[PDB]
């Protein structure tokens, strides 16, 4: 399993050491506070009322946890994922990053916590 | 497991099928929008700026989920546990409840859909 | 999770550590080398050739692995169980030698047993 | 999780759904009753008594379930494995094996039952 914090200003996200393989089931949690600009504060759900003007996940809000596992496409994270299997033919280690508009993430502050592990498959 | 929603008008909570037993290991992620009374909806962390004027837990914040573990005080949840064991001595079915001020229940809105595991041991 | 061994001659089986409650899904592996009373030895399934002549278990063979969950009647282990759900039954598990009464004091050798919860 | 009979007589081993990638925790019990000529039949640990005279696996006895994962040597695997890992550079698909000479499993008889699953990690 591995455990450590993604912040809102990375463009970049935060590689895990997890390795997502074909058939594996994974559990996520995560938590904590950010925001992309105003002062005030979301969870990893992010803020549900704000538009999309170029998020690099289109199926999450702003502000949201996000991942890839390998060269994916973003994949929405928000609180967590209970017991999951990847719908689609992913495969490689899971970077976490937080859903905003490129270029526009240095307004953002905060930081997710999450912890990852794999599940009995 | 066990998989259910948790009303956030719901003072009673909602008592699950998972019976927390000695040495039990447990995984619970919790998502979705709720409200303890404005517009706005917070995750299941609830509102972080909101004051406390008497919640049913001291330990989280307005509006988040929380349980209790057979007839033990309320433990906060948030988002999840992730592979929790539970304090010395506490045992007996799990209770979700939305965290609000005793009274004040009747203008909350939304759910949390949660999901609650067994880990090995 | 619980380690140990368990001895053929024991006729009052091994107590363990792991409590079966309702819901819980267990994975047993069991290894090793006993006998009931010949030079021979098996393994955790036992002897497929000994006829029952009043076994604590009439569900296993002579000379397998079987078990007690608090109470209950014996349950077959054998080489184990995978991610299995007890009927009905909830307590301590003890892990006994297939065995008639009486006959365990000519036994020899003893079973490897690993035993965990799994995710429910 | 895989679930499946590997005969006796079958050379070839049966292979499995599992790919065991670096860094799995796998379990696997094995049971059943099967020969490697003779009419008596041996459990999953195979004949204690026979000889090896160019056994595939000379770690284990004569009639024992083995295994490969991927194009690797020969590991036992007897009545099973708990949370077990593999060494280090071992990976792919794993093929169960009855141990046997080769060229000699024309005469053998029976079968194993086997379950293997992913742990957590
Ligand atoms: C963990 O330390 C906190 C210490 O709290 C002190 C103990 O308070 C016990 C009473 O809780 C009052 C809060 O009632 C909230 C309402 O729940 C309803 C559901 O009930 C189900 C259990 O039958
Ligand atoms: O969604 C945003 C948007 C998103 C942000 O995180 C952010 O920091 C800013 N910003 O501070 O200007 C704009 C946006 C955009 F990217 C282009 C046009 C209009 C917008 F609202
Ligand atoms: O925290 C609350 C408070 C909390 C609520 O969920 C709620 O629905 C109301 N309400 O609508 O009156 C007040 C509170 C209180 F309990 C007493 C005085 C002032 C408050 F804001
Ligand atoms: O199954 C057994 C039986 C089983 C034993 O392990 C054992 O040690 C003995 N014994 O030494 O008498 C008999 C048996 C029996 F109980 C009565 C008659 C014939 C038997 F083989
Ligand atoms: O261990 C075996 C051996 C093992 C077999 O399973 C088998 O079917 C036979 N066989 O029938 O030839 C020989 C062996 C051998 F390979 C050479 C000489 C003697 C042996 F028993
Ligand atoms: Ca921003
Ligand atoms: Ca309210
Ligand atoms: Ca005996
Ligand atoms: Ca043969
Ligand atoms: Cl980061
Ligand atoms: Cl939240
Ligand atoms: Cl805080
Ligand atoms: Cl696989
Ligand atoms: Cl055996």
């Known amino acids: ?4 914090e993604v912040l ?6 935060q590689v895990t050491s ?3 393989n074909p058939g594996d089931v994974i559990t996520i949690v995560a938590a904590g506070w950010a925001s992309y600009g105003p002062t005030q504060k979301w969870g ?6 704000h538009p999309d003007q170029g998020l ?10 996000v991942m890839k596992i390998g060269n994916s496409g973003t994949i929405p994270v928000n609180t967590g994922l209970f017991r999951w299997v990847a719908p689609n033919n992913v495969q490689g280690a899971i970077t976490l990053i937080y859903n905003d508009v490129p270029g526009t993430y ?3 502050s ?10 009995q498959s």
Chains 1, 2, 4 share one sequence.
Not at 8 to 13: D, F, H, I, T, V
């Open 56 to 65: 690099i996940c289109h199926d999450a809000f702003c502000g949201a946890l």
């Open 110 to 119: 905060g930081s997710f916590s999450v912890n990852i592990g794999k599940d």
């Open 8 to 13: 809102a200003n990375n463009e970049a996200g």
């Open 106 to 108: 240095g307004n953002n």
């Open 44 to 49: 990893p759900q992010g803020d549900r009322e």
């Open 1 to 4: 399993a591995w455990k450590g």
């Open 18 to 20: 997890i390795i997502y």
